[PDB]
C-alpha cells in the first residue's frame, strides 16, 4: 500500500541525521573489529567508504532512492554501492532501535550546545543593557496598572534572571542526553559482548545507558528537552508582551529598530513589533510539540513500538525555533531605543502615597495608622484639587503632627526607588549587586559548557 509506505517512511526528515548516523557507524565498526567480527583491512574499507558518504551528504550530492525507508537504510545502501558485500557486516549485532536513539542523542547534544550559546548571549545582552541604563526610572506595573517607580534595569534583570534558570535547566537536560544508548540492540542488549566503553569514548558520550530495554524505548530526553524549551518560550512570551505594550504610542516608552518591526509609508511613525509577535506565537508552537510527545508516550507498552518515530519532527522543529527566536530576541533587546523622557514623565505623585506612609512608619507610627494618615492626605489633596506633593506642611500636620519638613524628601522618584536596598530590590546598590551575580552565573554556565 503506497499510503502505508509513505506514512511509515521517515527518510524525508530523518535525513538530517545523516552525518551523526555515519559517526555512530564508524564508532560501531571500530568496535566490531576489536571484537574480531571485522578484520583490520575490512575496517579500513568500511571507514573509508563511510567517509565518502559523509562527504556526499556534506556536499549535498547524496542521492536518495525511492527504496530508502529511513536514513539508516539509505546509508547502508550507499555503503554497499561503494565497497561491495563487506558493507553487510557493519550491522552485525546492531539494531535500528539503538542506532536511531544514538543518532538523535548525538544530534541533540550538538544542538543544545548551539542553543546554549544563543541563550547565554541573550542573557548577556539584557545584563549589559541593564548596566548601561541603570539611571533610568519608569513605572513598575501590577494588573497592568502603574504602581510605583522602579529602575528600568530592575525590569531587564527580572527577565535575565528567569532566562538563567532556563540555561540551568538546559545543562541538566544535556547531562542525561549525554549518555550512550548504542549497544542495547533491539531490546535485550548487544549479543556480541561489544565494548560499550569503547563506543562511549569514540562518540564522546559521558557514560553509558544502564538498561537495554529502557535505553531503546524511553524518550525522556525528548520530553525533557521539550519541557525546557516550552518554559523558555513562556519567559520569552512574557518579555514579548511587556515590550509590545511599552512600544505602543499610548505607553511610548520605547521604539523597536527598523530591522525588527514593520511599517507603512503612509504612517511613517507607526512601527509594528512583528518580531515580538512572532516570538510570542512560538510559545504555542513549542508547547504543542511537548503536548504531542507526551500523548504519544502515554500508555505505550514496552519496548519499541512505531509510535516512537514521532520524536524526530518535534525535536527538529523546536531546535530550529529556539535557535531563530533567541537570536531575534537578542537583536530586539540590543537595538531598541528607549525614551527616558517618556519613562520619567509617566511617574506620578499619586504613586508616592505608599512612600508617604513608610515615612511615618520609619518614625515609629504603626503600619495601620500610617496607612490611614496617608490615605487622608491623598483625600485631602483630592478635595483641594492638588497633588499630594503640593500639600502644605500645615495641611500635613492637620492629619499627623508626625509629618515634619523633611517629608519633602518623599516626593522624589529617585528617593523612592532608593528605599529598596534589601537584596534583590530596585535600589541602585541592589541592581549593581544583581549584575555582579548574573555575570558570575553566566560565567559558570558557559564554563559548564
Amino acid at each position: 500500500d503506497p499510503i502505508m509506505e509513505k506514512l511509515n517512511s521517515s527518510i524525508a526528515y530523518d535525513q538530517r541525521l545523516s552525518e551523526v548516523d555515519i559517526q555512530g557507524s564508524m564508532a560501531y565498526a571500530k568496535a566490531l573489529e576489536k571484537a574480531g567480527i571485522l578484520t583490520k583491512t575490512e575496517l579500513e574499507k568500511i571507514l573509508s567508504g563511510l567517509e565518502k558518504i559523509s562527504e556526499e551528504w556534506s556536499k549535498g550530492v547524496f542521492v536518495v532512492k525511492q527504496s530508502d525507508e529511513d536514513i539508516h537504510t539509505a546509508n547502508e545502501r550507499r555503503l554497499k554501492e561503494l565497497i561491495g558485500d563487506i558493507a553487510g557486516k557493519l550491522h552485525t549485532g546492531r539494531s535500528r532501535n539503538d542506532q536511531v536513539v544514538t543518532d538523535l542523542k548525538l544530534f541533540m547534544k550538538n544542538s543544545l550546545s548551539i542553543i546554549s550559546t544563543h541563550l547565554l548571549q541573550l542573557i548577556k545582552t539584557l545584563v549589559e543593557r541593564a548596566a548601561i541604563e541603570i539611571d533610568v526610572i519608569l513605572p513598575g506595573y501590577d494588573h497592568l496598572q502603574k504602581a510605583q517607580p522602579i529602575r528600568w534595569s530592575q525590569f531587564l534583570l527580572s527577565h535575565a534572571v528567569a532566562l538563567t534558570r532556563d540555561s540551568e535547566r538546559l545543562g541538566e537536560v544535556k547531562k542525561r542526553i549525554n549518555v550512550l544508548p548504542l549497544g542495547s540492540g533491539a531490546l535485550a542488549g548487544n549479543p556480541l559482548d561489544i565494548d560499550r566503553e569503547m563506543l562511549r569514548s569514540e562518540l564522546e558520550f559521558a557514560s553509558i545507558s544502564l538498561n537495554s530495554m529502557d535505553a531503546i524505548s524511553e524518550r525522556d530526553f525528548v520530553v525533557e528537552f521539550l519541557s525546557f524549551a516550552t518554559l523558555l518560550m513562556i519567559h520569552l512570551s512574557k518579555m514579548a508582551e511587556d515590550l509590545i505594550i511599552y512600544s505602543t504610542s499610548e505607553f511610548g516608552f520605547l521604539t523597536l529598530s527598523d530591522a525588527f518591526s514593520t511599517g507603512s509609508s503612509l504612517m511613517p511613525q507607526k512601527k509594528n513589533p512583528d518580531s515580538l509577535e512572532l516570538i510570542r506565537s512560538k510559545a504555542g508552537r513549542v508547547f504543542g510539540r511537548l503536548a504531542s510527545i507526551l500523548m504519544v508516550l502515554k500508555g505505550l507498552p514496552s519496548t519499541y513500538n512505531k509510535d516512537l518515530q514521532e520524536d524526530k519532527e518535534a525535536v527538529f522543529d523546536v531546535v530550529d525555533t529556539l535557535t531563530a527566536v533567541l537570536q531575534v530576541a537578542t537583536g530586539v533587546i540590543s537595538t531598541l531605543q528607549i525614551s527616558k523622557e517618556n519613562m520619567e514623565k509617566a511617574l506620578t505623585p499619586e504613586m508616592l502615597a505608599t512612600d508617604l506612609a513608610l515615612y511615618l512608619v520609619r518614625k515609629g507610627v504603626p503600619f495601620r495608622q500610617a496607612h490611614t494618615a496617608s490615605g487622608k492626605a491623598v483625600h485631602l489633596a483630592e478635595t483641594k484639587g492638588i497633588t499630594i506633593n503640593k500639600l502644605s506642611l500645615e495641611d500635613l500636620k492637620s492629619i499627623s503632627p508626625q509629618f515634619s519638613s523633611d517629608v519633602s524628601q518623599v516626593f522624589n522618584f529617585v528617593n523612592s526607588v532608593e528605599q529598596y536596598t534589601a537584596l534583590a530590590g530596585t535600589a541602585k546598590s541592589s541592581v549593581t549587586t544583581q549584575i555582579e551575580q548574573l555575570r558570575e552565573l553566566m560565567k559558570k554556565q558557559k564554563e559548564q559548557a
Copy 2:
C-alpha cells in the same frame, strides 16, 4: 460588590492548606522586623506566642474561618488581632501578599517534595528488590507487542526502575530551585525597610535568597517544573501499568494482582480486574492536565503580578496528592502481585531462537548476511517438515551450512539465550546484578542529597 465576583476572586477555600507554612513565614518575618526596630522585644514575644496559638488551632482543626476571610493570609491576621490586640497590625509592615504567597507555596512544595521523594524511592527499591529475588525468571521480550526473544523478568522490572530513577534525579533538580527564599521582595520592587533577608533565609531554612524582586513575585517556573517532573513520572507509571494490565490478562497469564489491588465478582471468582493500574494510568492525563493549565495561564502575561497567577495553587495541591497516592499504590501492586513462573517459561518458543541460530554462525566467522540466510533456510526446512527448529537433525543443518556442529544444540536453551547479553546493560544475569548494584548506589546518593 458582586457575590459571584467575590466568590470567584476568593482563595480561602483551597489556600487554607497553606495555614501552617503561612504562620511559619510570619514568625520568621516577625523576628526580622524586631531586628529592624519595627517591633519591640515584647511585641515580638507576644506576636510569636499568638502565631503559635493559631498554628495549634489549625493543627487541631478548630480554627474558625469567617465569611469575611478572602484568603488564608487574611484569616491568620484577623485571628492574630483577635488574640493579641493592636500590635498584631504591625506584622504586615513592609510585606506584601505577593511575596507572602510564593513564600508559603515554596515552603509547602519543599515539604511535599520530601514526602514524594520518600514514596518514589520506595517504589524504586521495591522493583529492585523484586528483580534481585526473581532473577532466574525468563519470559518473552516484546516489540510491537509481539513475542521477540527471551529476556529476564528482572530486566523488565529494572527497565522501569531505571526510568523512575531519572524521575528522582529531576525531583532533586526542581527541589533545588524551589529552596530559594522569595520573602522580602515586597509587592514588586523589593522590601522597603532594609529587612534582613539572610536572617529570613536561615529561619525558614531556605538554601539561598531570590535575586530579583520582580521575578520572585511574578514567576511560577517552580510550579511549571514540578508539574513537568510529575507528568513525565506519570508517563512512566502509565507505561508500567499498560505492561502489567496486559500481562495480567488470561490470554497472557503471566501474573495476577492481589485482592487488595484488584476487583472481582463471586460469579467469576478467577476474574481479577486491575482497577489499581487503570487508576494509575488515568492519572497521567489528570497530571498532564494541570501542566497544560499552568503553561497556558502564564503564556503572554505581562510583568509583574496579575491575578491570573492564583490558579497555581489548586494545580499544585492536586498533583502533590495524586503522586503521593499513586506512588504508594504502585509500590503495593509491585510487592504483592503474584507471577506465574510456569506460564512465563511456557511462553518461550523455539521459533524465538532463530536469531540466536544466526548468531551461532556469526560467532564462527560466517558473514552476517549469509548466516542470516542460513538460519532462514533452517526455519523453512523445519516448516516443510512440520517440526520446530530445535528438532532439525545435525545432518539437516549441515546440508544448510557446514559450520553447524553438534554444539549447536546449546542454542536451543532459553537460559543460554539470555546469557548472550553480557555487554553492559544487557539481560544476562551478571548485567542484571550490575544494574541492581548501580541503582542502589544511585538511590544512596539521591537520598543523601
Copy 3:
C-alpha cells in the same frame, strides 16, 4: 483492603453531585422494570416513594453518607434498602453501574448546558444592546496593538458578540448529542431483559436512544466536545479580557471598570485593578487543562469500560462551575463599565487618515498605486511644512495630484472615515445597525434552541 487504594478508587466525594439525576434515572428504570414484569405495581409505588424520600434528603442537605459508600450509586441504593427493605434490591436488576453512570452524567450536563446557555446568551445580549446605545462612539482600531484607523466602538463590541454567537451555536450542537439515552446498555453487551428503552427515553426526556451498547458505555465524546466548546469560549473571553485590560490602563484611558469588578487601595483611589478580567483570562488555562486531561485519559484505551473513565466527572464539574461564574462576571463587567468618549475621540489623529486620502483619489479614478504614492507625498509635505495632513492647503494638495478638489476636506473627518465601510460587515453606522439586527435574530433562534 488497602486504605490508599480505597480512597483513590472511591468517587463518592465528588460524584455525589449526581445524587438527584441518579434518583431520576432509577425512577425511570423502576417503571421500565414494572413494564417488563420484574416489579409488581405495588412494589413500584414503594420503590418510587422510597426514591422520593432520598431525593428530599439530598435536597434538604440531610443525606448522611457512610464510610462504605464507594459512590453515589451505592449510597442511594444503601439508603433505599434502609427505607423500604429487601424490595429495594430489585431496582438494579439488569442494570449496571456502567450504563447508570453515563445516564446520570448526561442528564446532569443537559441541565447544566441549559443553564450555561442562558448565561452565554445574556452576555451576548449585553454586548449587542450596549453597541446599539453607544453606536456614535468612535475610537482607534488596532493591529499589532498599534493605532491603525478609526472604527466605531460598537464594531469592537460586536466583533466579540459574533464570536460568542458561534460558541452558542457549538453549545447547541454538543447538547444535541448529549441528549441521547445510554441507559439500557448494561455492562457492555446490552440490557438482558428486553427492557423498553423507548419508555426510558420518554420518562427521562432524551431525544433518542444510543445505537450501540459497547459505544454507549465506553465513549466520552460528549465530555470531550463539551470541553472543546468550553475551551474555545474561554479563548474568546481571554481575548476580550486582554482588550479591556489594555483599554483600562491609564495610558490608554478608554474605560474604567466599576468598583464591584475591580480592586484597589485607599492610597491610590484612582488606580483600579481589573481582577475580574484577569480571573477570566486565567480560566482559559484552567478549562484547557481539563480538555487536555480527558483527551489524554481516552487516548489508546481499549474497549470497553475501564476505570480510567472515572476521571471525567471532576473535569466536567469544574468546567461547568467555571463557565457559570465567568459568564456572569463578564456580563457584569460589560454592562457596568464606563467608557471615556472624550479619551477615545482624542486618540483619533489626522495621521490615521492618510489611507482615506488615497481612497479619495481611487474613487476619482486614480489607480491604487499612484493614489498611494500621492498620499505618501502629502504626508511628507505636511512633515516638511511643520503641520498635519488635514492642514495642507488645496494648493499644497494640488501640487501632488490635480485630482484633489476642494471637497477633499471631507476626508479629514473621523465620522466620514468610518462611514466609508458600508459593505456588509464593515464599521459604517448602517452596517453596525444591520449586525445588531442579525445578532438579535441569532440569539432568538438559539434561545428557542
Copy 4:
C-alpha cells in the same frame, strides 16, 4: 536581519495555497470590475494573467524569488511580470488580512470534502464487514478481562458508531468554514462598497461574515477543525489498541495483511502491526496541533497579529495526517483476517454464571437471591472440580427450586448473546437494526 526575515517569511509553506489564492484574486477582480475600479478590458487581461500563474503552479514551474515574503506577494509579483502595471489595481481595497483567511477557508473546504469521503468509506467498510461476519462470536472485555460472549459485529459497529459522530462534527465545522471573509479589509471592512454577495457566489461560499474585525482576527475555524480531528484520532487510537491487542499471538483473534504489517524471515508467522502503531501515534501529533493553536490564540488582543501566522502549518499537517490515516485504517479493516476458531475457543462456561442468575430472574426470583444462587452454584462446581455446565439438575434444584430442566439453554453461547434484543444490544436482530440505521446515517451524511 536575515534571521528575522526568514522567521517572518511564510512563503516556504503558504505556497500550498497557490491555487486558492488565485481563485480568490479572480473573484476579487470580477467584483472590482463591477464596482467600476477595473474596466472590462482591464479585467480580461488580469484574469488571463492569473490563469497563466495558475498553470505555472500546476505544472510545477512557478519560480519563487528570494524577495517573495508570502504566496500573495509571489503571485502579485508574477502577475506584474506577465501583464505589467495593470496588475497593481488588483489589490485595491483588499488586505493580506482578509485575503489570507479567504484562501485558508477555501483550502480547508476542499480538504474537508476529501476527508469526509475517506471517513465515510472507513465507516462503510466497518459496517459492511459487520453484516457479513454477523454470526461470529467472541469474548467482550472490560478492564481487559473476559466478561461475556458478544458478537464480533457488535465490536465493529461500536467503532462505526463513534466514527459517525466524528462525521457529524465534520459537517458542523464545514458549515462555519463555508462563510466568506473576503471584503473585510484590514479590519474595518472593505472601503469601496465591493459587492460581497457577488464575491460569495463566485467563490461558492454559503454566506458572508457578519463582522470585519472578527472575520480577520478569529481562527475558530482552525481550532474547531483540529478539535474534530483530535477526537477522531482518539477513536482511531482506541481501535488501533484493540486490534493490536487482538493480533497478539496470546489473543490470536486476527492477523493483519502483509501490506499493513511488518515481519522477519527468521520468524515468518510473526507480524508487527506497524500500521496500527502509526495510527495510534498520530493522536498525539494531531492533539499537539490543537494544543499549539489554542495557546497561540489565548490572550491575544484585537485585531490582526502576526501570531496568527502559525495556523497554516498546523492545518496542513492535520489535513495530510487524516487523509493518510483514514485510508490506512480502511485498508487494515478490509484486509485483516479473523480466526473464527480462536474467537470461539476463548468463550468459557464461567462466562455464563451471570446468565444463570438471569435465568432465575425471569422465573421470578429476586435479583439478590438469583445472584447468590448462581454464586453458590459456581462454588459447588469448583469444589466438585467441574465447570458450572456440568452440574446436575438435582444439584441445581438443591440451591434453588426454581431451576428446571430448561436451564440447559443457559449453557449455550449463542443463546447468551441472543438475550440482548433491547435496541443497541448484541443480539442478531439488534445488530441487524444497527447496520440499517448506520447505512441510512451515511446516506444522510453523504447527501451533505
